[PDB]
Design a protein around this ligand. Sequence first.
Ligand SMILES: CCc1ccccc1-c1cccc2c1CC(C(=O)NC[C@@H](N)C(=O)O)N2
Ligand SMILES: CCc1ccccc1-c1cccc2c1CC(C(=O)NC[C@@H](N)C(=O)O)N2
Lengths: 274, 268
Amino acid sequence: TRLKIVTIHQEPFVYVKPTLSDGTCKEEFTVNGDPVKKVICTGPNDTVPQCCYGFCIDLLIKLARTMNFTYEVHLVADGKFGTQERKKEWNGMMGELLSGQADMIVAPLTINNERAQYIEFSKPFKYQGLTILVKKGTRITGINDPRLRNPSDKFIYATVKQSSVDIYFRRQVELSTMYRHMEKHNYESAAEAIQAVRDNKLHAFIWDSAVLEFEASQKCDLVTTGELFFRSGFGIGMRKDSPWKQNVSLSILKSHENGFMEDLDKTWVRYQEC
Amino acid sequence: TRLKIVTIHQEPFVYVKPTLSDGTCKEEFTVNGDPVKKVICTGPNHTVPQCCYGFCIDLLIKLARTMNFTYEVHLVADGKFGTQEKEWNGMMGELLSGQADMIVAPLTINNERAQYIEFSKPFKYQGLTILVKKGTRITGINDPRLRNPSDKFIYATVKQSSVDIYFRRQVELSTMYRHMEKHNYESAAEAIQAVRDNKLHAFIWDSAVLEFEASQKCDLVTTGELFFRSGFGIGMRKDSPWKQNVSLSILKSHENGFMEDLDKTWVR
Ligand SMILES: CCc1ccccc1-c1cccc2c1CC(C(=O)NC[C@@H](N)C(=O)O)N2
Ligand SMILES: CCc1ccccc1-c1cccc2c1CC(C(=O)NC[C@@H](N)C(=O)O)N2
């Protein structure tokens, strides 16, 4: 049985590029000489084949080899991570897992309570926090800043629509006007919001620290500010009683102990130049 | 249903004190003035009821209040975390033989243990460090004193932890295993005292525990981060009907401020 793997565009965990003329992927190599491994993902580009690669595709490839299965990677239809909205239905990668469109989510998918009620998560492959991406020289103290708590058109802030960050701000935050403001401004994808911070369309992007710290490392105009809230993991997503549960988690724990995960960090995440 | 909980002495996760004359626990309060919740636990000191409290005990009480199991707690008989040497000893051993239904302790999540039992989602994520006397600095595992050992610098860990059998099995660490096989301790608290007495020069152990010890004691510091990070989790047998509700509760305790409050109370 071929596992339908679903994923999403999210650097540096998943890079998405167009194929060449002949339908292959461009032969790239890391600075240390090793081949960069890529797969033919299908999905929307504004269904046609594209080249997928990164932290999470290297991980997919590991698990494939260890558990001996075949995969067909596809990009989530709506371009979302997945929330549950009013009959309350799950969207994004979460919706696709449950409805059968996917067999496995391989992505920087945040492990939380809500989602774990409906799917199985592997043991975390990474552990990380929330932070705020801003222009260099924009001191944010924390969650309770004046410009946030008392919002305005002079200082716009946002997150990505239909992530666990979004529904938590809508449904759960102890603050009225913040979600009213944020609902006006939230972005469809993380790449768009990161670019908006650069082009001054957005003054603060609330998002995964693993993505934003990587982004700030490569962009000297951008800094992160805050360890907001608490830490949470990324894990593989599966249906609650699929027979892969045990071995996916065994593989990830083995990957942490034999240094394979540390290597994925060195290849894709750990970077500095500013 | 009623669950048999097995736990282990490991400050600040589990403290163990004598009961009163009449076999009850005295009421105590924290630095804040909060009520120290305590549970009767049986075990060694000749098997007497004792009083058990701390991070892991507050976590057990929370799990019980969410899912409505009753419990009786006891301290592991042989005193150990558990290694496979194909039968397990320690808390692993008790859980597998049915002397416990659930392990509640700073129990390291690793591949080998996860082949035999279910772990919950982690309640804490941490790593290995070294407890030394202040003024000692260690770069990492490849410090001369570790790589090429002697009586001039004693170093050790606790017998029958994950650490122990990991050092004993690695071909790379052959030279270290033979020196540690002379000096490995029975309990963490014994090893920690040795660092103060200058009977042990370097104790290799969990950062959550050793960072707490250095906070209390100005003579001690932690130096380094060895290897990689790993979690603590609740242990259960593979076919426990509580494993889904345990993990859900742990995930929610990260998101509702509960774990953070345990940190303020017991750790910082
Ligand atoms: C908000 C805080 C929060 C509330 C309730 C539960 C979890 C968190 C949490 C804590 C720390 C990082 C992080 C999240 C969500 C989150 C996120 O949504 N990331 C985007 C993406 N990885 C995706 O899966 O939606 N990242
Ligand atoms: C390279 C040691 C190792 C090998 C394989 C898998 C994980 C680790 C690891 C990494 C980070 C902290 C920590 C350990 C073990 C460990 C330990 O054994 N502590 C004692 C106690 N918590 C108990 O559960 O036995 N503490």
